[PDB]
Design a protein around this ligand. Structure first.
Ligand SMILES: O=C1Cc2cc(Nc3ncncc3Cl)ccc2N1
Ligand SMILES: O=C1Cc2cc(Nc3ncncc3Cl)ccc2N1
Ligand SMILES: [Cl-]
Ligand SMILES: [Cl-]
Lengths: 124, 4, 124, 4
């Protein structure tokens, strides 16, 4: 087509979705991780994660307001990844990289799994 | 705004 | 902080939200324009438009599944703006610029109003 | 990935 494009549009949308998350506006699901609870928007979770995409396209699970993650999932690793979903920023540190990579593999967040693999390989 |  | 950032994350999120819109997955509102109906996600509409932000933060209207726009709003202008919300791409043409600008002013989409004003000024 |  002959469209024009606003460069900052996608980033501004994500910033506003994160503002809605901060203020708990229109959040429609609780993600339970080892008794730690995280409120979010199903659509943002689906847009970021192959696991959430699969969960919320399921005809029964799409209607659930609570999702319990596997007990092996670390709440801090999940928190870091949820923040990344809403900001594009990943707080990757020596002390959390193993939990973050394991959580990203479970959530099916391929680009995160990729940078974790590379950061681990650089330290070996 | 740009030409994509 | 010491975060790393994935450059394409925001664009990939928006692309996935538009794929959900195309497939009518988790859409939670119908926008009615001169008897033309558009399904969308409230959170994306709020992230893009000052009007929808105001509507869906209202304690009564946040729960509505149907929103009727002012009868002066042109369905094609709305359609072009809804596409822009989900893609960052604006189909601005000589034949639609007046309807698009009027719709963007009503929806409170300041960057769109700005490029319409500039494109109109260039032709005068 | 970049340093923002
Ligand atoms: O690594 C990843 C990130 C990711 C996101 C999603 N999401 C969607 N894919 C396609 N259409 C709509 C949506 Cl919401 C699916 C798989 C994966 N895998
Ligand atoms: O031009 C525009 C675009 C736009 C978007 C919104 N949205 C939000 N603002 C702040 N926190 C959350 C959200 Cl969802 C409000 C006003 C305007 N005005
Ligand atoms: Cl990712
Ligand atoms: Cl705008």
């Amino acid at each position: 087509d002959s469209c024009i494009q606003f460069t900052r549009h996608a980033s501004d949308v994500l910033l506003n979705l994160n503002r809605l998350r901060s203020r708990d506006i229109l959040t429609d699901v609780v993600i339970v991780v080892s008794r730690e609870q995280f409120r979010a928007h199903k659509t943002v979770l689906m847009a970021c994660s192959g696991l959430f995409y699969s969960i919320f396209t399921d005809q029964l699970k799409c209607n659930l307001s609570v999702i319990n993650l596997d007990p092996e999932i670390n709440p801090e690793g999940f928190c870091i990844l949820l923040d990344f979903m809403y900001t594009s920023r990943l707080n990757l540190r020596e002390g959390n990289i193993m939990a973050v990579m394991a959580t990203a593999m479970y959530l099916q967040m391929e680009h995160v799994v990729d940078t974790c693999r590379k950061f681990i390989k650089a330290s070996e | 705004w740009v030409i994509p």
